[PDB]
Amino acid sequence: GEELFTGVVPILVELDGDVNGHKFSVRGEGEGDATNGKLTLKFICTTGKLPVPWPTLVTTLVQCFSRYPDHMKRHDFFKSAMPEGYVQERTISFKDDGTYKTRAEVKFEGDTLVNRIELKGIDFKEDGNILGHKLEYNFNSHFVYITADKQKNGIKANFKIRHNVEDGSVQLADHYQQNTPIGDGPVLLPDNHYLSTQSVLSKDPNEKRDHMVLLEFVTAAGITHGMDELYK
Numbered sequence: 001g002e003e004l005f006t007g008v009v010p011i012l013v014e015l016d017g018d019v020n021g022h023k024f025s026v027r028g029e030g031e032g033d034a035t036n037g038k039l040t041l042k043f044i045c046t047t048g049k050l051p052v053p054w055p056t057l058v059t060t061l062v063q064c065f066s067r068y069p070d071h072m073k074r075h076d077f078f079k080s081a082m083p084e085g086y087v088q089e090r091t092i093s094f095k096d097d098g099t100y101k102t103r104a105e106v107k108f109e110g111d112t113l114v115n116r117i118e119l120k121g122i123d124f125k126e127d128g129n130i131l132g133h134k135l136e137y138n139f140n141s142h143f144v145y146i147t148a149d150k151q152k153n154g155i156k157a158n159f160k161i162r163h164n165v166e167d168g169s170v171q172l173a174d175h176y177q178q179n180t181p182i183g184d185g186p187v188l189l190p191d192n193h194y195l196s197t198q199s200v201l202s203k204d205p206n207e208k209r210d211h212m213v214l215l216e217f218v219t220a221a222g223i224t225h226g227m228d229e230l231y232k
């Protein structure tokens with residue numbers, strides 16, 4: 001629950017991926033400050049050069065660090081499932097191109113929040129925007145729409161990621177997401193709401209490996225009951 005996130009929490013991220021047969025691994029380390037909604041992470045492709053653009057992996061590479069307003073805390077499924085954790089699965093459909101399917105487990109190893117991911121990508125075009133590395137190294141702001149999934153005792157989400165392309169166009173990546181708690185502990189199943197996300201991608205000038213430095217800010221919104229400063 002909430003008590004596990006009141007301070008700064010170390011994060012580890014591990015990703016094993018296969019896109020069109022290209023096998024790669026990514027490791028990340030950093031920390032999260034859920035009280036402010038802030039993540040700071042650095043990711044390295046430990047197998048060598050990454051075969052897809054780093055921005056395509058941002059959403060896959062810990063929504064338990066979202067800042068939920070006080071009046072919305074009872075709608076925070078992600079923290080409610082901690083420390084035992086949750087499974088997060090997605091299908092990501094790149095318009096006019098291939099698809100990623102991802103399965104991750106997000107849980108605590110003691111003080112550290114760990115996101116361990118398997119990713120499979122298929123049907124990508126060899127000189128599409130992904131395998132052709134035509135996406136700009138930057139990231140837009142989005143809304144993540146959450147609803148409860150009673151049957152699976154978890155949540156579903158949907159959203160559309162917009163990836164800038166180097167020729168000025170936009171590459172859409174449609175996200176379908178399901179989260180299921182690990183084990184049988186009680187959880188908070190929320191009313192419909194959304195996350196508001198913002199991200200900054202950068203590079204470490206002293207890092208020669210293929211890598212991504214990430215700053216991310218996420219808050220929850222879409223419910224107003226109990227937010228008394230809004231009465232005025």
Ligand code: NA
Pocket residue numbers: 002068072073074076079
């Ligand atoms: Na919360």
